[PDB]
Each structure stands twice: as structure tokens, then as C-alpha cells.
Amino acid sequence: ATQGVFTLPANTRFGVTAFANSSGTQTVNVLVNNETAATFSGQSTNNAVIGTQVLNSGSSGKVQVQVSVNGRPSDLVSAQVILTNELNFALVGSEDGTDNDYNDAVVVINWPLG
């Protein structure tokens, strides 16, 4: 199944934060309505925040997370969780190799903000 795609409420500010846990350099592309809205690139084996930004979900609300290492797409896992019918997390893990820890880039999207 498709992973890393989330439908947010339209025209809503959200946070997107990427963590790295791999020897490979992680490149994270955040698309809003199928257009790149933020790009992160970094390397860490210690869960470093390689990027964190506030974006707007735009007219469509479609947010997509892509992860690649040396130009090759990582395998993604994702889900959305809602607490007390209000607090939203969209969660992504990715695997760039063979050990299947799925933490090589970890992306957390959260809303509402403010």
C-alpha cells in the first residue's frame, strides 16, 4: 500500500520534523499538493533533527513525505494517530538498507499548531 501520504485539513499550519539514524545521508522531501515545500538533508546515527519547519497544508491538504539515500527511494511505513479527537500525528519511518529497523529517516508531522 501507499505510505507517507496524508490528507490534512485544508489551509492548516502543521509542523514537519525529520530525524536521522543511519550511516547514509538522508534526503527528505515534503510535498504539499504534489509540489516540494521543504527539503531536508543530513546524516546522523544519533537521532539528530536534520530539519523542522512549519508548513501550510494548502488548498488540497495533501502532504507527502519522500525519503531517499544517494538518489534511491527508501521503503516507507506510515500511519496517522489522533488523540482526544483534536491532536494529530502523521508518522513515517524509512529503511535504506537490509536490517529493517525503519528508523533511517523518521518523520513526524503534527497539527494543530499555535
Binding site: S23, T98, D99, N100
Partner: peptide, 11 residues
């Protein structure tokens, strides 16, 4: 890390 290194085989 790459080849030969902590692949995830459990050997």
C-alpha cells in the same frame, strides 16, 4: 554501513 556489516541475518 554496507556489505558485511550488521546485515540483519542473525547468524
Amino acid at each position: 554501513k554496507x556489505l558485511x556489516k550488521x546485515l540483519x541475518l542473525x547468524l
